[PDB]
A paper describes a structure:
Among the centrosomal proteins, [name] and its ortholog Sas-4 plays roles in centriolar- and ciliary-microtubule elongation. Free tubulin is ubiquitously present in high amounts in cells in contrast to [name], which has lower expression levels. It is known that [name] via its conserved [name]-3 domain (amino acids 319–394) sequesters free tubulin into a non-polymerizable 1:1 complex. In this study, we therefore investigated the structural basis of [name]-tubulin interaction and identified that [name] via its conserved [name]-3 domain forms a high affinity complex with GTP-tubulin and prevents it from polymerization. The [name]-3 domain, at the N-terminus of [name], is conserved from invertebrates to vertebrates.
Using isothermal titration calorimetry (ITC), we determined a 25.6 nM binding affinity between [name]-3 and tubulin, and found [name]-3C ([name]-3's C-terminus, aa 372-394) is sufficient to bind tubulin. In this structure, a loop-helix motif spanning residues 372–386 of [name]-3C targets an acidic microtubule outer surface on β-tubulin, although the last eight C-terminal residues (aa 387–394) were not traceable in the density map. A GTP molecule is identified in the β-tubulin nucleotide-binding pocket despite tubulin exhibiting a curved conformation. Recognition specificity arises from a number of water-mediated and direct interchain hydrogen bonds, and hydrophobic contacts between β-tubulin and [name]-3C. We observed a perfect shape complementarity between the crouched [name]-3C loop-helix and its binding groove along the vertical axis for tubulin polymerization. Key interacting residues within [name]-3C were then confirmed by structure-guided mutagenesis and ITC. Notably, F375A caused a drastic 109-fold drop in affinity from 25.6 nM to 2.8 μM, indicating its significance in forming a high-affinity [name]-tubulin complex. In addition, F375-containing [name]-3C domain binds the β-tubulin at the microtubule outer surface, which might allosterically disrupt microtubule formation by inducing or stabilizing a curved tubulin dimer. Supporting this notion, [name]-3C alone was sufficient to prevent tubulin from polymerization. Noticeably, the last eight C-terminal residues of [name]-3C were not visible in the electron density map.
Numbering used by the authors:
A (entry chain F): 372 to 386
B (entry chain E): 13 to 168
C (entry chain C): 2 to 38, 47 to 438
D (entry chain D): 2 to 42, 45 to 360, 369 to 441
Amino acid sequence: KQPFLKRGEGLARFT
Amino acid sequence: DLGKKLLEAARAGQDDEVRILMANGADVNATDASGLTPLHLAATYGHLEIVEVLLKHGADVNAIDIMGSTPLHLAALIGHLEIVEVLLKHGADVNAVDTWGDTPLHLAAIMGHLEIVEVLLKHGADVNAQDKFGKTAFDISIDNGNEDLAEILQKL
Amino acid sequence: RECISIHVGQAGVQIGNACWELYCLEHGIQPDGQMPSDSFNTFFSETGAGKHVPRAVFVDLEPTVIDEVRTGTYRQLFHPEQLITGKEDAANNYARGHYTIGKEIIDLVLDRIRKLADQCTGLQGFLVFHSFGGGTGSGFTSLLMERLSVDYGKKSKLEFSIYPAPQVSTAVVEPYNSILTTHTTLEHSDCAFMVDNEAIYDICRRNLDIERPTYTNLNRLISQIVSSITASLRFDGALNVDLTEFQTNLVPYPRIHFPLATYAPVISAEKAYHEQLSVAEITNACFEPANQMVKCDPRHGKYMACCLLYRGDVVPKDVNAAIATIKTKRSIQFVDWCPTGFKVGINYQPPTVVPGGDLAKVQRAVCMLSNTTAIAEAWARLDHKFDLMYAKRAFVHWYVGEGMEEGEFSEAREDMAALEKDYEEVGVD
Amino acid sequence: REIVHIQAGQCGNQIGAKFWEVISDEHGIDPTGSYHGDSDLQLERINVYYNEATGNKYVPRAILVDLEPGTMDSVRSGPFGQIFRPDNFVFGQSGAGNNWAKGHYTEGAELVDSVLDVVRKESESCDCLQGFQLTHSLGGGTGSGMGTLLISKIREEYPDRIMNTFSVMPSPKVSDTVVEPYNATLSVHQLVENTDETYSIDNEALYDICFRTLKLTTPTYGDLNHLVSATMSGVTTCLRFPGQLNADLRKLAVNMVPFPRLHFFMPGFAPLTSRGSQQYRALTVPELTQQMFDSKNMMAACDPRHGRYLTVAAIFRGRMSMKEVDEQMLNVQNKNSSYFVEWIPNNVKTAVCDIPPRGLKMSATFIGNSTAIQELFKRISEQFTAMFRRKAFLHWYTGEGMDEMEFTEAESNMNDLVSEYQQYQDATAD
Ligand SMILES: Nc1nc2c(ncn2[C@@H]2O[C@H](COP(=O)(O)OP(=O)(O)OP(=O)(O)O)[C@@H](O)[C@H]2O)c(=O)[nH]1
Ligand SMILES: Nc1nc2c(ncn2[C@@H]2O[C@H](COP(=O)(O)OP(=O)(O)OP(=O)(O)O)[C@@H](O)[C@H]2O)c(=O)[nH]1
Ligand SMILES: [Mg+2]
Ligand SMILES: [Mg+2]
């Protein structure tokens, strides 16, 4: 079954 | 088991399949694992003819699944106006409350089904019924900013 | 003897344009560098064909502003290789200017500066023009200043920094950029003249009757003041004759290196027949807060130094009497550890104005340069805006995403807190 | 410099086509790509949205996508339909029937690499790519499901570029499908994590404006899209003409987005006009200012006075006193100071642009980052939760191999978003 986007994944863009 | 077959037939809208199965003794009030009956599923997926047929042959119009949903809840949630009215005509409890404290009015209101709201109201929907957060359908419309709904819900 | 001017980011470049415009007018130089027919050779080199070329570099991370210089009235005045541009700017973000985007072009800038430095027989150092507020003006400048400190450790570096104002502001994070670049530039700068865009804005509306000042209005006024300050470097004179002397006269105490400039008279070009003001009148006008380049109140502070730079029809005995008058009319408290003697320079050439500027010709003008603890009010205003946003970490992720540690915010802020106490301690009362 | 524009699904291509019509006219470009205006301001930054082929003919840097093939034909038969690069039409055979799982996983994934090839090609012929803008609905399956897939693939491939979206939010008043809250919540989850800026265009707000203000008893998509096109023109003005403030996507973002997840903007504009009548008078600057801050002029169905502004951008277009603009903008800020967060000093920036939009001499566009936008997400959330608790039609999603936990993940993220808006709404400087 399809893996999915997790909460907070986009916060890495700024570290 | 003709029950499981009647359930799937009622969900898929296979009118003919429904007829044959009942002729062969299929339980009209069979339940799936969550306690949904063929009338719940017909009411959910919008199969009006199957609704009326089940109701002519012993379907409990006020059966509840494990979460306390009645057919009228599901019709009101999904927005099937003709089905709501058939259910009401056959004795559906307009003020049935489910495990979240929702009534059919709450659900029609939340989803913006304004025709269904008017119908429920005319059939005696309780405007003071609170859900488990203490909200009535009217609370929902004013927290929502839904002015069209709030006016309908206020009509004396 | 030579000085190299470096102009960084939109503000630095546009003010640079206005300054070199005026410098050419003052020394009799045409936009192609020719001079119809020694002092100014500190700011201009000379070719064999009689072409006088500014010792100046313009740098921006984006090309719009410098492309106007390249195609405009002075398209032939500068070394074309000293007009340097990237393609992508710092997006009002110190960290982009300092750590990311700036690193892409820093080596070219230094090699082109080296080329100017190699033409000098006795380089004094650098004049650096930039905003506090932009990502380039703040971030790239501090990168440049760091590198210039390694590559020219013995040289003096002077700044002209544009302090942000809400009337013409273009970014919410300008207080961040301002404190970040001050922190990292403090060690590398010998003397820095802050230009408060709000002070200039007010003067334009009040003294020049400009309803809504533009950068073009602000810059011509700013350049007139910069010219008053650098004139001693470009002419014969007895006060501030080289960069070293700026620090000697205006900066007795190395972290407190932010002199207040005050300029008078500022008179509308529409008032071409104004009766001329006396030495007494323009000198007095130098202790009016309304004429300052930075908004603050010097009566609330103490003076550590004071230079008066006169231009035009000014008799020395009249300056002395005018000075005697202010020293006994006015509350000017010097700190107890320095000579309370105003230093005086006089340049007898009438001040120059740009035709079609907003300024009237005058027969005498004066720029006062004073180091007063009062300018700490300007720092306090920035620091407070910094603290409001930083408490919430508003916008901080933009900087951390571009090569900067979050700890650098609090480090810069503590350094600012230390700078403010230095002012409090010097202004012992 | 360059922006690459992508339009996905029915709604995405409809408002997308409208955008291109509108800015083409503003820039003096006709449907064949020839410039025919008389202002140099029109062409100075034409390269932001248009490729320039020889010659001298201009082509939109636009990629047109849908799983439904029919969408091709309607765009092409449109007024400016022939101006798009024929190779930039990327379409499927079926399409997703309002199924976000189909869009993303199943059917989008089948299409997506074709789209990315075209994106890659538009990108390599850019001098210095700024980033991407996507137009899409959140309520369907393609614009929503495949659109967010595209976004995630573009994030992987261009991680340092700005991703901007014009996302239209579903409302029961406009479309008769009860899975739209599912699709919108799954999408909002993706946008929270992967976009830098999202203009929240609320069909609820658009319908109400048309019905109650513009007195259109039966609003069409055309009626709604007239509001959207006016808004899209306004909010991209600073990107398309010379100027000081918010002149590119990154500068706009650094000014508007204090916290990375809170990047959902509420757009507004004044004056609101019904298409095809009438006119005027032109507004005064005070009238413009007051209307552009008015709740009734917002394209999101939220009352700004129920929350606080973190940041605001305001764009005035047309010939007018810059000084009167400054006075009025200062006015609204200090008469209503309690509505602007105190811990972001000077959080309202104002731009003036001298070229008005079509039909007008003066207009104002509002861009707000307001905590009140939580009302939009609370509304979606409540409908999502009503449906998801009864697990209605869930098998339609899991049938495409989608994990049910993705529903719960998306729901939690959106409710977290709401809590965050509230946290900063109640925050104090003290
Ligand atoms: N006086 C004056 N101030 C200016 C001028 N241009 C910009 N400013 C001010 O400079 C600050 C913004 O910095 P800029 O110089 O434009 O930015 P930058 O240095 O170019 O950096 P980025 O554009 O961010 O890369 C604001 O406080 C503006 O009001 C000008 O020509 N004159
Ligand atoms: N404002 C506006 N909304 C639209 C328009 N067209 C569709 N919508 C809304 O968009 C939402 C989703 O619909 P679509 O864009 O048609 O779906 P799709 O992206 O094409 O995906 P599938 O049809 O399921 O393959 C619904 O809420 C519609 O109300 C339009 O032209 N303007
Ligand atoms: Mg710049
Ligand atoms: Mg479609």
